[PDB]
């Protein structure tokens, strides 16, 4: 809210009182935090793009996922993303230990809605199932590069305080594609983490209801690991209450 300060000389009683409104410092703090988080997320995204480049695949991401024949590259990209997320949670880890299998489904009767990437052991080693058609559909869905997204007082204050500044094939569309892939693989990684550390039955229960994620993860994630990418924003379904009533 507000505070005030009083200046006074030791030998004198003439005191000068000033008042401060903390809203200004609140704006400073909020702007600093927003900038810091934006920088962190952009750094992570750039790092992801850079390692994918390091793999040195000729085609762009969407073309790769469209090329059904070259399962090799799909598996490479998926594993690299999964390992990147794993390290982002455990920076000291740079490999994945146990070897990994991969399969690329091609039909609805082979895919599971809501979990394009999933895991299942063959009783000896873990296999990652990929819904390449779903990946292609997501990355191909037309994106909005125009509309903006969003207290009016602090909004105006930020508008008037913060400033603005007026050879890569990447547009905002490709950045969005990369972010979507990262988020999907992050969701899959959370499922896999719950699996590995709580058993296949717990993994199945999580698939049924993600809510268990709360405890099964926050026990370790919020404390020791970098926050989830989604943590950058609070997400919600438009007209959620009426939709639930429906």
């Amino acid at each position: 809210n507000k505070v005030r300060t009083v200046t006074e000389i030791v030998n004198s009683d003439e005191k000068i009182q000033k008042t401060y409104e903390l809203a200004e410092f609140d704006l400073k703090n909020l702007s600093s935090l927003e900038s810091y988080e934006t920088l962190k997320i952009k750094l992570a995204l750039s790092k992801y793009m850079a390692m994918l480049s390091t793999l040195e695949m000729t085609q762009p991401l969407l073309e790769i996922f469209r090329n059904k024949a070259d399962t090799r590259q799909i598996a490479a990209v998926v594993f690299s993303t999964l390992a990147f997320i794993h390290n982002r949670f455990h920076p000291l880890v740079t490999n994945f230990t146990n070897k990994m299998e991969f399969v690329v489904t091609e039909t609805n009767d082979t895919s599971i809605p809501g979990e394009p990437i999933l895991f299942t052991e063959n009783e000896g080693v873990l296999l990652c199932s990929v819904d390449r058609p779903s990946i292609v559909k997501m990355l191909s869905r037309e994106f909005d590069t125009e509309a903006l997204v969003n207290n009016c007082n602090v909004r105006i204050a930020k508008t008037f305080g913060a400033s603005k500044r007026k050879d890569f094939s990447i547009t905002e569309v490709e950045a969005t594609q990369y972010l979507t892939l990262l988020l999907t693989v992050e969701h899959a990684y959370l499922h896999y983490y719950i699996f590995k550390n709580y058993g296949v039955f717990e993994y199945c229960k999580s698939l049924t209801d993600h809510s268990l994620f709360t405890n099964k993860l926050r026990s370790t994630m919020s404390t020791k690991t970098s926050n989830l990418l989604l943590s950058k924003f609070k997400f919600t379904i438009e007209d959620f209450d009426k939709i639930n009533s429906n």
């Binding site: 598996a75 489904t105 082979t110 809605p113 394009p116 999933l118 199932s129 037309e142 509309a147 989604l230």
Partner: protein
């Protein structure tokens, strides 16, 4: 006469929204629906799609029957309109969405809905899990890597800085919105095609979990 170009633009935007082919979200109105239908009627190219949608004016709880030639013509027309890829699944999605819109009554508040009536038997998530998991286990790993390995991190800090500069003007808010809605709409399509109820509650529970982890 009519502004066939403006009609076409409105038709394209409405079709994109009703086919979930664009994360872009904007207001729509009966003026837009009329734009769309008039454009479809006037266009010789799109007569088949016009007929399809017009059939929605009836009970609309029916599966249109088309020859393979008819289906190919319709898909070609739609693909040329949206310039993409596509599927008769998207055709059915548009049919259902437009049928719901046409049957809907004039109102002041846009009716927020979820995907419904696409692709008869209602299946639960548990049944889908069992069946899909059995089929997956039947499937065999197309490819694999060996144990260990090493994540191929980049090294060129100059390259990283160049990429950072290239991405700076991208609003994280817009990118997040686009990605989240892309995933949500693809999940919606999968559920509707599978004829399995979409668990809005759990989908939102995902973000609930995100917040609960963040707060700690």
């Amino acid at each position: 006469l009519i502004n066939m170009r403006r009609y076409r633009n409105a038709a394209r935007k409405l079709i994109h929204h009703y086919s979930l082919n664009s994360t872009s979200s904007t207001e729509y109105k009966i003026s837009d629906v009329v734009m769309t239908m008039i454009f479809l009627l006037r266009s010789e190219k799109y007569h088949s799609l016009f007929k399809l949608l017009e059939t929605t004016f009836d009970d609309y709880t029916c599966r249109p029957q088309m020859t393979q030639v008819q289906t190919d013509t319709l898909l070609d027309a739609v693909r040329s309109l949206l310039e993409m890829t596509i599927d008769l699944t998207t055709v059915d999605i548009m049919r259902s969405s437009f049928a719901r819109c046409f049957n809907s009554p004039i109102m002041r508040y846009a009716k927020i809905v979820l995907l419904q009536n696409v692709a008869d038997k209602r299946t639960t998530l548990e049944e889908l899990l069992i069946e899909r998991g059995e089929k997956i286990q039947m499937l065999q790993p197309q490819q694999y890597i060996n144990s260990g390995t090493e994540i191929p991190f980049c090294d060129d800090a100059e390259f990283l800085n160049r990429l950072l500069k290239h991405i700076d003007p991208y609003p994280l808010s817009r990118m997040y919105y686009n990605a989240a809605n892309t995933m949500f709409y693809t999940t919606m399509e999968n559920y509707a095609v599978s004829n399995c109820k979409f668990n809005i509650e759990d989908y939102n529970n995902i973000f609930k979990v995100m917040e609960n982890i963040r707060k700690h």
